[PDB]
Design a protein around this ligand. Structure first.
Ligand code: ZN
Length: 74
C-alpha cells in the first residue's frame, strides 16, 4: 500500500517510543506483512510491519481502513 505522509519513520516496534530504523518518502509503496496495536496517531493506533521488518504508523498508509487489513502480528 502507498505511504501518504511526507517522509515517514519506520520503527523497531509499534509505537513512537521505539527506535527509528529507516524512512520512506511520500508515494513509496510498502508490503504490509502484519499489523499491531500501539501508539495512537491521530485516531489510528495500528502500526504496520513492512517487508523491511519495521513498523510504520497506519495513519500514514493508504489502506482504506483505520482498522486491520492484514493479520494481527503474532
Ligand atoms: Zn503496496
Amino acid at each position: 500500500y502507498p505511504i501518504t505522509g511526507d517522509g515517514v519513520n519506520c520503527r523497531s516496534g509499534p509505537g513512537t517510543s521505539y527506535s527509528v530504523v529507516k524512512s520512506y518518502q511520500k508515494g513509496a509503496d510498502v508490503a504490509i506483512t502484519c499489523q499491531a496495536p500501539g501508539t495512537d496517531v491521530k485516531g489510528d493506533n495500528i502500526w504496520d510491519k513492512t517487508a523491511d521488518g519495521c513498523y510504520v504508523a497506519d495513519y500514514y498508509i493508504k489502506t482504506g481502513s483505520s482498522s486491520y487489513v492484514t493479520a494481527k502480528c503474532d
